[PDB]
Amino acid sequence: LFIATLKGIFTLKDLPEEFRPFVDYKAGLEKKKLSDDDEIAIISIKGTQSNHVLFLSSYNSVDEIRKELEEAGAKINHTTLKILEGHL
Numbered sequence: 001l002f003i004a005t006l007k008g009i010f011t012l013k014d015l016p017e018e019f020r021p022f023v024d025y026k027a028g029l030e031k032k033k034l035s036d037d038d039e040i041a042i043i044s045i046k047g048t049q050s051n052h053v054l055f056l057s058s059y060n061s062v063d064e065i066r067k068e069l070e071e072a073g074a075k076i077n078h079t080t081l082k083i084l085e086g087h088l
Contacts, residue, residue: 003045005074010040010056023053043073055088 009015010023013034023040027033039059044051052072059065068087072078 003074006044006051007073008042010038010042012036012038015040026053041069043069045074 008017010017013021013024013036015021015023015038023042026040027038039056040053041056042051042053054069054072072083
């Protein structure tokens with residue numbers, strides 16, 4: 001009885017903790033690259049029928065990065081993909 005917030009961690013090629021990779025396509029959508037550093041994070045929120053796939057360029061370990069995500073997870077809603085233009 002709440003906002004089912006899902007947060008799947010996608011690390012390297014083994015990111016498909018479930019089974020088959022769903023983003024792997026983005027890595028091969030144009031000979032991107034298959035490195036063991038690739039890092040992705042997808043978060044859904046009963047958004048009609050989907051979620052928000054983000055690209056974790058460089059993740060260290062500081063609230064700065066923690067806040068950003070949580071923000072694009074169930075916080076303020078983006079309607080101008082501005083953030084991506086400022087950090088994506």
